[PDB]
Amino acid sequence: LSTASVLAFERKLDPSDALMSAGAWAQRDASQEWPAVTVREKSQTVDVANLPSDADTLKVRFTLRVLGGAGTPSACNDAAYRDKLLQTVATYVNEQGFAELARRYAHNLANARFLWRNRVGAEAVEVRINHIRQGEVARTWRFDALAIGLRDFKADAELDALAELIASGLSGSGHVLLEVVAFARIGDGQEVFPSQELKTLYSVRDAAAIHSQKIGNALRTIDTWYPDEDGLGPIAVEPYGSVTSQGKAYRQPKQKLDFYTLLDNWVLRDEAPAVEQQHYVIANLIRGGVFGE
Amino acid sequence: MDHYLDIRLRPDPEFPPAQLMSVLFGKLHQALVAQGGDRIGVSFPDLDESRSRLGERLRIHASADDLRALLARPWLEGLRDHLQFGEPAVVPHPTPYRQVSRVQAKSNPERLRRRLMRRHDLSEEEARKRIPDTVARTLDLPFVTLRSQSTGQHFRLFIRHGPLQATAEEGGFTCYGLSKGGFVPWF
């Protein structure tokens, strides 16, 4: 009949804080011993973290787990709306599974989009993705961030295997943990960019890193399903999908292309398109948040 | 100097502009010291409407020598994903009087009073207020960021376009300074 007063969806697709450290070129195999790069203070006063002179390569390591159980809310007010909402996620996953979304998530893991202000001048980034089955590697992967684009949808068999792995995760049929290590040649003594605190850089125990939701916004760049005349590219998924740096705010509630009007048109009265905006609303439910009154 | 290269920065949520222009000009001084820096310097076309904003287009301005033998063919560019640059040609023949240049002013009196300290081991009251820059601080209108190159902290390049009167032209120098042009065409 109507919408519940509260409706929260928890965080599936959980990233960690990517630990960054120094390293040398063409030594990509035995990665266990390199010192983590911390943050120093210079001159009102600024905190600056720089690579050493004999360290031309930056390593970033992050372990993405995926939870699964996509359209399962945690806090509601009525069982009728919950039953219809589970019916909508059911007819999604039976109409078409986690096939188009997971290829985009595996693409954003494949290209080093999570290296935010280092990929803009990165001469060579390689990524190794290890699927952790029991305590060690089950299946390994090997990509280069340059050969994979950042705006067009490529195709590979190994990337189809990684998409099938993440899809077997998000559908609820396994425990999925992916250790991603990215080696990036930057050269001697440039400026790496760990995240900034409330100018103070972020470090956990004398070791700088990138925040968790920074990397979590790196892979949420799967929204191409919006009615603009092109020129931006793939944007991140939010209700009234918007970019804070540009100041532009698409999907505005005058034009029915947002999350909420699409929700009460599809869940209550069954109006939603085939693929595109359905992929947007399921990607927002996978991201999670609080909806309702 | 009749060979041009219009580099148009593609919009993205991935890196909001101006920092982007500094990555560009830092990859320009990168490929400067390969050869020498007397002939080619940069421009900023069709993008000086608001009087503090440069924008997203950098035109390469050497005549056919240091276009297809400096950066394009005989170098590795870099970014190549937010630009998607094209193929050169020969320029038209307007009369825009052809001048751009750079400037640097003073906006922090601490540097000047530090060199007043080491002037002649001067006492600190004249080092503070002889005629200081503490009364007013200057500001130059178009701006880039420009991280440094070797063993030091970041520069801050301020550029200004010269006399844009459509009267005449002359045969001038290519690039005075380091990597910004002298006489450059304007459409």
User: Could you tell me the CATH number of the domain that includes residue B154?
Assistant: 3.30.70.2540
| Identity of the residue in A42, A149, A233 whose CB atom sits nearest the CB atom of B12 | A233
* CB proximity A40 to B under 8 Å: no
Q: A76 vs chain B: nearest CA distance in angstroms?
A: 34
Distance between CA atoms of residues B34 and A108, nearest Å: 35
Neighbours of B175 (CB within 10 A): 23
DSSP states of B46-113 as a string?
Answer: T--SSTT---SEEEE-SSSSSSTTTTSSSS-----SS------B----------EEEE-----HHHHH
The DSSP secondary-structure symbol of A95 reads H
* Tokens 């980034």 -> residue: A125
**In this structure, what token pair is assigned to residue A232?**
């931006």
CA distance A181 to A34: 13
Q: Is residue B142 part of a domain?
A: yes
User: Is B118 among the domain residues?
Assistant: no
Residue B96 included in any domain: yes
CA-CA distance, A17 to A20, in Å (whole number)? 9
The DSSP code for B33 is: T
Rounded Cα distance between B48 and B52, Å, is: 8
**A52 at the B interface (CB within 8 A)?**
no
Chain B contact set for A235 (CB, 8 A): 13
Phi-psi region of B162 (alpha: psi -120 to 50; beta: other; left: phi over 0): beta
Q: Which one of A245, A248, A250, A251 would you mutate to disrupt binding with B, by most B Cβ within 10 Å of its Cβ? A: A245
Could B79 and A120 be called an inter-chain contact, meaning their C-beta atoms sit closer than 8 Å?
A: yes
Which residue is closest to A231 within chain B, CA to CA? B11
Alpha carbons within 13 angstroms on the beta-carbon side of residue A115 total 32
Q: How many domains does chain B have?
A: 1
H or E element that contains B114: helix B109-117
> A238, A90, A106: which is closest to A166 by C-alpha?
A106
Contacts of A249 in chain B (CB under 8 A): none
Q: Does B149 touch chain A (CB under 8 A)?
A: no
Task: Please classify residue A38 by burial: count the beta carbons closer than 10 Å to its beta carbon, then call 0-12 exposed, 13-18 middle and 19+ buried.
Answer: middle
Length of chain B: 187
- Cβ <8 Å between A233 and B147: no
Torsion of CA B21, B26, B31, B37, to 10 degrees: 90
Domain limits at B99? 3-104+137-185
CB A195 within 8 A of CB A214: yes
* Numbers of helices and strands, H then E, in chain B: 3, 4
Among the listed residues A188, A187, A147, A245, the one whose alpha carbon sits nearest the alpha carbon of residue B80:
A147
Looking at the domain assignment, is residue B160 inside a domain? yes
Contact A63, A180 (CB under 8 A): yes
Residue B114 lies in a domain: no
Contacting residues for A245 by C-beta, under 8 A, at least 6 apart: B13, B16
In a domain? residue B125: no
Is B148's Cβ below 8 Å from some Cβ in A?
no
Are A121 and B13 in contact (CB < 8 Å)?
no
Interatomic CA distance for residues A80 and A84, integer angstroms: 6
Q: Least CB-CB distance to B78: which of A121, A191, A233?
A: A121
Q: Do A236 and B13 touch (CB under 8 A)?
A: yes
Nearest chain B residue to A192 by CA: give it: B147
- What is the rounded CA–CA span in Å between residue A56 and residue A186? 6
Q: Shortest CA distance to B57 belongs to which of B8, B11, B4?
A: B8
Q: Could you tell me the two tokens for B38?
A: 């007397």
Annotated catalytic, B61? no
From residue B4, how far is each of A178, B65, B90, B145, B184 by CA, in Å? 47, 11, 7, 25, 10
**How far apart are the C-alpha atoms of A181 and A59, rounded to whole Å?**
7
In chain A, where the domains are located: 1-10+70-97+222-293, 11-69+98-221
What are A48's strand-pairing partners? A40
> Cβ contacts of residue A179 below 8 Å, gap of 6+?
A61, A63, A129, A130, A132
The H or E element containing residue A60 is strand A57-66
User: Is residue B150 assigned to a domain?
Assistant: yes
Resolution (A): 3.4
CB contact under 8 A, A150 and B14: yes
Q: Is the dihedral of CA B124, B129, B135, B141 positive or negative?
A: negative
φ, ψ of residue A284 in degrees (nearest 5): -75, -35
Q: Which residues pair with B6 in a beta bridge?
A: B59
Asked whether residue B109 is domain-assigned, the answer is no
B42 CA to centre of own chain? 7
Marked catalytic residue, from B29, B61, B120, B161: B29
Strand, coil or helix: A208: strand
DSSP state of B117: H
CA distance B43 to A173: 57
Helix (H) or strand (E) holding B127: helix B124-129
In this structure, which amino acid lies at residue A55?
A
| DSSP string of A142-205, one letter each residue | -EETTTS-SSS----HHHHHHHHHHHHHHTTSS-EEEEEEEEEE--TT-B----B----B-BSS
A59 phi/psi in degrees, rounded to 5: -105, 135
Q: From CA B159, how far away is CA B141, in angstroms rounded?
A: 8
**Cβ of A196: how many Cβ atoms within 10 Å?**
11
C-alpha span between A193 and B162 (Å, rounded): 36
Best mutation target, A107, A120, A223, A229, to test chain B (most B CBs within 10 A): A120
